[PDB]
């Protein structure tokens, strides 16, 4: 049944197996093993160190995020800014990456305001980090953080930074994140400048 909330997203997704294809509207898509991100993670971790590995993965989340936001942005006009926005959290779910449970979410584009506080349930990345590195001294959902930052930044037309305050990878129960405009914490290829600041986590 429904499950009616995300139905305009699913509608957009076509599975043509006899032809080797999958579509999210115009965009072509793949169904993948999380192994290939696990591998990328092990590899890069040792070729470059952690810092550069971390950045890379925020970058890749970021571009995914931006992309989903592009593809969904005309999509919900008879709904308010927030029911719209949630497009992002929802795709993250559809794509089998993480479950988004809204603790708080308020946003106004014109007022240039944003506050998101979300629980992140069964993060695919947290699993993957643990089964290659074990318990981390810090939160490890880098790709999911990037996507968050990427997706939101587009929808809000301004830079929006998130901090994972709890992570299953540190032995918290579930991961958790808070997101505000850049301006409200402490102190293009603008896309790559943003990646850098998500790296200054606390």
Number of residues lying near its own copies (CB under 8 A): 52
> Residue 160 carries which DSSP code?
E
Angle CA 170–171–172, to nearest 5:
95
Which among 14-22, 109-117, 154-162, 178-186 is the span making contact with its own copies, rule CB under 8 A? 14-22
Rounded least distance, CB 52 to its own copies, Å: 8
Q: Site for ligand JZ0 (CB under 6 A): which residue of 53, 72, 123, 152?
A: 152
Q: Site for its own copies (CB under 8 A): which residue of 87, 100, 149, 155?
A: 100
Please count the other Cβ atoms lying within 10 Å of the Cβ belonging to residue 12. 16
Interatomic CA distance for residues 77 and 97, integer angstroms: 26
Map residue 91 onto helix, strand or coil: helix
92 touching its own copies, by CB under 8 A: yes
Which among 53-61, 109-117, 133-141, 181-189 is the span making contact with its own copies, rule CB under 8 A? 53-61
Interatomic CA distance for residues 67 and 57, integer angstroms: 15
Which among 58-66, 105-113, 157-165, 193-201 is the span making contact with its own copies, rule CB under 8 A? 58-66
Give me the count of residues in the chain: 202
What does the block give as tokens for 42?
């092990």
List interacting residues with ligand JZ0 (CB under 6 A): 88-89, 91-92, 98, 100, 116, 118, 144, 147-148, 151-152, 177
């Amino acid at each position: 049944e429904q499950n009616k909330d995300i139905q305009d997203l699913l509608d957009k997704i076509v599975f043509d197996a006899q032809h080797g294809q999958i579509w999210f509207d115009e965009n072509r898509m793949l169904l993948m093993h999380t192994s290939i991100l696990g591998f990328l993670r092990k590899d890069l971790y040792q070729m470059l160190g952690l810092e550069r590995t971390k950045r890379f993965f925020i970058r890749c989340g970021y571009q995914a995020g931006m992309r989903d936001a592009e593809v969904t942005s005309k999509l919900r006009p008879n709904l308010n800014e927030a029911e719209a926005f949630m497009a992002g959290p929802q795709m993250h779910g559809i794509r089998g990456m993480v479950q988004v449970e809204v603790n708080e979410l308020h946003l106004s584009h014109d007022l240039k305001q944003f506050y998101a506080d979300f629980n992140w349930l069964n993060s695919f990345e947290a699993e993957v980090h643990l089964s290659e590195f074990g318990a981390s001294d810090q939160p490890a959902c880098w790709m999911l953080l990037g996507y968050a930052c990427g997706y939101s930044s587009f929808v809000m037309g301004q830079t929006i930074i998130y901090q994972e305050t709890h992570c299953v990878a540190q032995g918290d129960e579930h991961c958790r994140i808070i997101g505000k405009p850049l301006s409200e914490w402490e102190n293009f290829m603008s896309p790559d400048a943003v990646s850098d600041e998500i790296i200054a986590l606390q």
